[PDB]
Amino acid sequence: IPADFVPDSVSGMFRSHDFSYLRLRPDHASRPLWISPSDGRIILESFSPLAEQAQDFLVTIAEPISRPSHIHEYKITAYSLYAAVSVGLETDDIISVLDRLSKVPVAESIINFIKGATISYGKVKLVIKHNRYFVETTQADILQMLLNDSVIGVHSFEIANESVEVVKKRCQEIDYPVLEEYDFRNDHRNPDLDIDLKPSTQIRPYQEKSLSKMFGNGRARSGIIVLPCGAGKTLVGITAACTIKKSVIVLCTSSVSVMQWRQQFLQWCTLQPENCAVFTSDNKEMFQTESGLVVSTYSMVANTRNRSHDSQKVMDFLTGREWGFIILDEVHVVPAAMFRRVVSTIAAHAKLGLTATLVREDDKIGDLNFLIGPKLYEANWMELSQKGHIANVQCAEVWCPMTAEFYQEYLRETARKRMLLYIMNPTKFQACQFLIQYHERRGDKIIVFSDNVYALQEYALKMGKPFIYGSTPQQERMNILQNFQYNDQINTIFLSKVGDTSIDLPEATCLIQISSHYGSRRQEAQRLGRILRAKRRNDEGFNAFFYSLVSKDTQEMYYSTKRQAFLVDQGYAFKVITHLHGMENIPNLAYASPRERRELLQEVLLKN
Amino acid sequence: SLKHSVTQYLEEIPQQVQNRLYTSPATCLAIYRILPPLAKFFIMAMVFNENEVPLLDLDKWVNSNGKLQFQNAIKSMKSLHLLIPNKSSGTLMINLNPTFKISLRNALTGGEVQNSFGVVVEENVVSLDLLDEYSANKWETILHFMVGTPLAKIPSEKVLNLLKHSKLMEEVNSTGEFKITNEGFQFLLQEINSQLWTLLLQYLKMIETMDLVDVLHFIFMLGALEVGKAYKILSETQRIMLQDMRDYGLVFQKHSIFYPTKLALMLTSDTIPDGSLIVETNFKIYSYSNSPLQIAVLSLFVHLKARFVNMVLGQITRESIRRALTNGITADQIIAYLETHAHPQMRRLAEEKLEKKLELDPNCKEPLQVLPPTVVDQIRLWQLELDRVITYEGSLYSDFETSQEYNLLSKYAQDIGVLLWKDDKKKKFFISKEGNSQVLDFAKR
């Protein structure tokens, strides 16, 4: 309150949030940014000049909250600021740009917060030599700051391989955030790999921007690249591996996804098959060439207790060599209790993380800062949707009213048994069948998700359609996916939590949900990703669909409004469908008579 | 609705009173400005000539394209009885009212007027510092008191009784409080010119034995007076009227001399947009308004989060919408506020969205919508949540000796529209409490 600041009669409605004490600049009509002097929130006008010039600067320094059609909303925090400085940015540049783009003068509170979050970047650097990690520094003065540190223990000192996760986290608190850069141009000890992108490739604009933020200064930066599902993160990793020209290892959270890496990898670049090896439960042979590629999964690299005699040799092969590049697909699972060990065991000069969603329920999301690096680039979902790179989706949330017969038992039963009770309500069966028939007549490929295995099998058998879940062998699920892609007879397939992410189905154009995890917002975004890469995503008037069948007046509605809190932030709008037109005229519907409904109630309650 | 509302009332007043209302030229000069442009043209043609002109001559003046406007102009002029039609020798002669004719002639030619426009004391006061502040504070108090926002100085009993008597600001002694009504929201959305005329019309309707002609001679004369000058004091009835109007912020009179204010002149005629807001699919609000009024009205159905000098940002939530519906505000009005106060960007994008859907087919698949459909659906869906359970007060009828009796009593209730539910199998039916007495009386007979 740097003035008399007579409060307005309505100032009471704003509890300590009234920011009218500051005045507006004469050039307000041009400057697009409003800055909250207390909470750090930033409001951006996407319909005014200099909006594009700020849509990228704000992303670098601030993590988005919500980016709807017109008015964007960012927020400045310590985590976001750490990312900007790590790539290389001084407080002067941020202050100059923020002041130049702010309708109102930047308050001292925000200036202090940004100034306080300043680091002496580049003083400490972690290097790898013959599988030995040395914390080298460019000046001797740092030794008095590190060697005398309580936790620890042109100058460097040794550190244990496993203890890297301690020093890096400690380095975050002693004001020296270490940087993991790689001089692959000047690195001759590691055997180089000669792979380049073939001429047929065409790197999209956003892909180049994502790579520029990593190789901007010429040294491979270790960080995370965030792009919408289906944006081409696989090609981003391929390009990063192709330009680095060194042995690379890839970790993906499935066996199907591991295979699709190899197929796409052999396609987009010139890496011959002789130099590629896949390490999964089926086959474990390793490349004998001097420098090659290994594509595997966390489950095959993170296991510690018992390893098979055939797989123990592979782990030694992975650990023994000093790899030059590691790509972590779906990096939202690396900060788990055990998966993070893949960052300390497998030595790698540069670590890249690729994920569409960078959120999770617990607070371990920030652990990525000291594990693989900061967030380099993030792309708006709507920006790529309007440019034709990813298909548009008309999301919907169908309200299926639970019948009285089933609802009467929904109250008495316990919580652990309620889930199975409101997932198999007869009305949901009718809705799912009607939608599938309508879209099949529309010449669409449909995907149905269900976190509950019992519901998945029951739905599959009733409709006589294939299903995939945990117990399905790799060969069977791969065959099912290929058939669903190329076979005309197989129009739709039922998936489960296994295919919730990292499966490429370019022919998919419609998605339906009958079950879902408790409250995970990440799963909803990942499921929607299956259809964002539709082949016919550019023909006029095309609109993919995403249905969420829920039970009216049930605990599922509580989660449904909470399970779509991330998509709403990106700009997707969820509408409520209370009725399906032309649904009664369908000849036959499941559980249409009371006799069948009562039989289902007795059948499901038996398991309960 | 400004000229329609004032004109409509004048059509209800008996012609015997309209003739007396035209005696004061001050009133005629104001009544002359409310008529359509064609009516003023014809009236100015007939005022200066003391002769009768046939209706056919007037028809010749208007062109074929403007023929439609001629029908409305004559209809409005004849309804007010300003134009007296008489037929002689098969000719529909048209003449002007002698009282209205003389009044206009004196006003334009500056003849005897009997101080219809008042007098001047030649003691002017500063208008920006006092008149603007006085009316603005007085008008703010009534507006804020209407919006429900807390405010120390509550309006006097005169206007307060007017509000309660009218549909504005429904109050109940048993509840001990006041809240806005369905019409109250519409009143708040009306411009200053309409926001003032509605109150005056209610006052003019509530007036019981000042004199009706005196009230109009003062209201219209107030518009004749120019702001920022003194005027000596007038009729006995008008004296209390002047004091009563002092509570509405239209006139300033300290402790022998009264001064009109901006609102007094605003009564006669009129005088990015302030109030335009953007609504996203995230249920957020960003209003480009800087005023205690536009912010206060938004708080009726919005959860404000922070304020800036140039804009205010809020969020639509279930609690806020429920808070608005509990006061009686219909969702149809909320969407109207969001539609009539939409930012140009929303309209441009909607037009582009419609444009991408216009050339495709003649149907266009949709009409133009400024704001996303999902906001409308959620707001309407929440309203349904309030009407989830419907309860009626009444009595249940059962234990009927004969089926004919059950049908007779039940059918009678249906005829008078007091039947809410019936069942032939159980010979039971339920009727509203309102119709209970009638049904019982019919049962005995």
Binding site: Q430, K575 | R380
Partner: peptide, 10 residues
């Protein structure tokens, strides 16, 4: 936008 229609059942 279908909000006033009957229940989705059947």
């Amino acid at each position: 936008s279908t909000i006033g229609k009957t229940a989705l059942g059947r």
